[PDB]
Design a protein around this ligand. Structure first.
Ligand SMILES: [Cl-]
Ligand SMILES: [Cl-]
Ligand SMILES: [Mg+2]
Ligand SMILES: [Mg+2]
Ligand SMILES: [Mg+2]
Ligand SMILES: [Mg+2]
Ligand SMILES: [Mg+2]
Ligand SMILES: [Mg+2]
Ligand SMILES: [Mg+2]
Ligand SMILES: [Mg+2]
Ligand SMILES: [Mg+2]
Ligand SMILES: [Mg+2]
Ligand SMILES: [Mg+2]
Ligand SMILES: [Mg+2]
Ligand SMILES: [Mg+2]
Ligand SMILES: [Mg+2]
Ligand SMILES: [Mg+2]
Ligand SMILES: [Mg+2]
Ligand SMILES: [Mg+2]
Lengths: 60, 114, 203, 99
RNA sequence: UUGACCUCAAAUCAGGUAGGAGUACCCGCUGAACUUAAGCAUAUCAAUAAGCGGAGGAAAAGAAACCAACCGGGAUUGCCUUAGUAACGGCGAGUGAAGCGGCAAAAGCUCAAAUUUGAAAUCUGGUACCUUCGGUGCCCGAGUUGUAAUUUGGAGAGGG
RNA sequence: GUUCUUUGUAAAGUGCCUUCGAAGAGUCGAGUUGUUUGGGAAUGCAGCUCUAAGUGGGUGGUAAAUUCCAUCUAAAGCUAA
RNA sequence: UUGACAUUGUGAAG
């Protein structure tokens, strides 16, 4: 009950006590997030949109 | 130490700076062409007359001198990596652009909001 | 801009102007600690072409390294072996003094990653270097596509494994017939050439 | 540059219809540009002359250009680099006090 | 007097990060002798063991300052082969690669160096709210001693 | 497969004319010493000394001078099987 | 231990 009450106090806030954060592993907590890992430069995203991998078949 | 040793002319030329009288007149003219601030940047963004402002930036100013577009160049005399600015008096002399070695890189930054 | 003029002027190291600048700066560096933080690059043009950027997360450090050979650390010069291994004085370290500079800076700031380094000065006793460092924890780096590759755990302590520019030269990582011993890694190549390969149906 | 069609000789080899590939821009890497010429000339006026270049100029005036190449080979590496360096000093001498 | 700048400090300042373990395989440093030569010092054992530093699920290498001398091939790695060959060696004992050819797997790329100059267009942090691996507004700060867009030699850029 | 948002006087590709086309320095390279390699007038690596060029520079497995040819583009960086 | 080069600059005379 006490730990649940504290979670309501820190709901939404960007900083939480370390005991209420996800454990996982040390290496997993230091890895780049999904947003950080997917970042591309403006130069590269223009190339990706212009020339993506096409789908084709050898029929005729 | 830098005074005890002999100073080559390329560096020694920076010991002469514009005197207090015409330097004040110089900054008086330059203060009339302050770049637009972020506050009045919002007003313009939210159709406009052609602006007149002081040009700054070492790469930006050097390109202007090489294209014979700068009419007057102010040079700070206290750049610690002196190589950055040491070639400007010769470059201006070669290109025929008048220049003045002025005292204070902080004072130059004041009129460009830096 | 002005970077082109800096590059050409830096090549005239025995001109009157640069001889004066190196004498004053070498004295100033000698008065500081062997390793100390630098507020800004001494050679901004050189830093840019090695990958440095003027933004939060990039750090410059200056380090001083002793010159000369590597005396063999044996008691009273006794080696206890055959005469071919009896030399003490004329021995040379297989890594450059630049590599030693990066490694010591890397241990000092273990939260950072070594990117590159460059020569600045030297006297009879010391060689001087400036090392470029990137903070892998700073959000300006992790959110930047051109530099967040350094945040990968595979790039931890690049200087210790000889993965920097000076490390790869000392490892002999180059193409051609002149680098047959070290093209893919000296020890890896030696293992391949000294391995007996036996198949199920013997050839 | 046409092959003879036999297995030995000066122009040995098979004869095929030849094509001219487009020039590669990488083959012009060491070509001087207008911007690069301007910077190098300005730097020479500012920085001045190296100590070993000063004594080479003296040898050219006092002992001729043949002994200058021998010294220039010593300070530099190959003898082909000494040829170019002595040539540059002669142009400097022409534009320093001769004219 | 007062207010900046530069450089250098302090704080149980706000938020983070490094150490140790494991170490079969991986990237480096350092580095022997027993042994073989029917003795022995060069050589060999061996660029090995021991010692030290640093990673990952693989590591490293990698889009040529390559190989070639052909009607040319075309990043890297591995297998078959080249080959116990060219070559090294008290030319003794011994040592010893590489190009081509077949195959497995296939993938390409980007910075520095250019004036956005009719507008630093860029970014950390704080704070409020929200669809919370983040978003928006606002406010300090970083930054012109150069942060974005644009261009990496196969090109490519400014005008028509 | 279906469904909610028009992103955008945004972005990318392609023809022809003209003017240009910035490309990494105590580094390449050289001497010497040590080590290493099958690399032999010296394969790579390192210390010290010297120290470049821009139709340049590196390589072409015998040192050197002279004349040609061929081939790549170093001294900055990332990347699955 | 001895010599050479580097550290290594400034002024005059024999
Ligand atoms: Cl030899
Ligand atoms: Cl780079
Ligand atoms: Mg090419
Ligand atoms: Mg605290
Ligand atoms: Mg290894
Ligand atoms: Mg025996
Ligand atoms: Mg026996
Ligand atoms: Mg015995
Ligand atoms: Mg071991
Ligand atoms: Mg693990
Ligand atoms: Mg695998
Ligand atoms: Mg890897
Ligand atoms: Mg390429
Ligand atoms: Mg290949
Ligand atoms: Mg062996
Ligand atoms: Mg060794
Ligand atoms: Mg031989
Ligand atoms: Mg030979
Ligand atoms: Mg890599």
């Amino acid at each position: 009950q006490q730990r649940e009450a504290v979670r309501q106090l820190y709901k939404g806030k960007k900083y939480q006590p370390k005991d209420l954060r996800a454990k996982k592993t040390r290496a997993l907590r230091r890895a780049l997030t999904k947003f950080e890992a997917s970042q591309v430069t403006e130069k590269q995203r223009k190339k990706q949109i212009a020339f993506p991998q096409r789908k084709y078949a050898i029929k005729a | 130490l830098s005074i005890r040793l002999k100073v080559p002319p390329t560096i020694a030329q920076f010991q002469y700076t514009l005197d207090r009288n015409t330097a004040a007149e110089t900054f008086k003219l330059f203060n009339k062409y302050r770049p637009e601030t972020a506050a009045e940047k919002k007003e313009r963004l939210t159709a406009s007359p052609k602006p007149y402002a002081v040009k700054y930036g070492l790469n930006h100013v050097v390109a202007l001198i090489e294209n014979k577009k700068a009419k007057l160049v102010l040079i700070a005399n206290d750049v610690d990596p002196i190589e950055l600015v040491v070639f400007l008096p010769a470059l201006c002399k070669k290109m025929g652009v008048p220049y003045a070695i002025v005292k204070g890189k902080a004072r130059l930054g004041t009129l460009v909001n830096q | 801009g002005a970077y082109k003029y800096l590059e050409e002027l830096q090549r005239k190291k025995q001109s009157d102007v640069l001889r004066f600048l190196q004498r004053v700066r070498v004295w100033e560096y000698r008065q500081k600690n062997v390793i100390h933080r630098a507020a800004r690059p001494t050679r901004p043009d050189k830093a840019r072409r090695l990958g440095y950027k003027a933004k939060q997360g990039f750090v410059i450090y200056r380090v001083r390294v002793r010159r000369g050979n590597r005396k063999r650390p044996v008691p009273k010069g006794a080696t206890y072996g055959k005469p071919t291994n009896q030399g003490v004085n004329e021995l040379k370290y297989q890594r450059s003094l630049r590599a030693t500079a990066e490694e010591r800076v890397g241990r000092r700031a273990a939260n950072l990653r070594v990117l590159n380094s460059y020569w600045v000065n030297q006297d009879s006793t010391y060689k001087y270097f400036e090392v470029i460092l990137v903070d892998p924890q700073h959000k300006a780096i992790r959110r930047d596509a051109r530099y967040n590759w350094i945040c990968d755990p595979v790039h931890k302590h690049r200087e210790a494994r000889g993965l920097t520019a000076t490390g790869k030269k000392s490892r002999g990582i180059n193409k051609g017939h002149k680098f047959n011993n070290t093209k893919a890694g000296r020890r890896k190549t030696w293992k391949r050439q000294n391995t007996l390969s036996l198949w199920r149906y013997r050839k | 540059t046409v092959k003879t069609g036999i297995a030995i000789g000066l122009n040995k080899g098979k004869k095929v219809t030849s094509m001219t590939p487009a020039p590669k821009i990488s083959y012009k890497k060491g070509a001087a540009s207008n911007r690069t010429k301007f910077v190098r000339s300005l730097v020479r006026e500012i920085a001045g002359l190296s100590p070993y270049e000063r004594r080479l100029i003296d040898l050219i005036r006092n002992s001729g250009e043949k002994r200058a190449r021998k010294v220039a080979k010593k300070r530099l590496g190959s003898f082909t680099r000494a040829k170019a360096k002595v040539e540059e000093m002669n142009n400097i001498i022409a534009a320093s006090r001769r004219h």
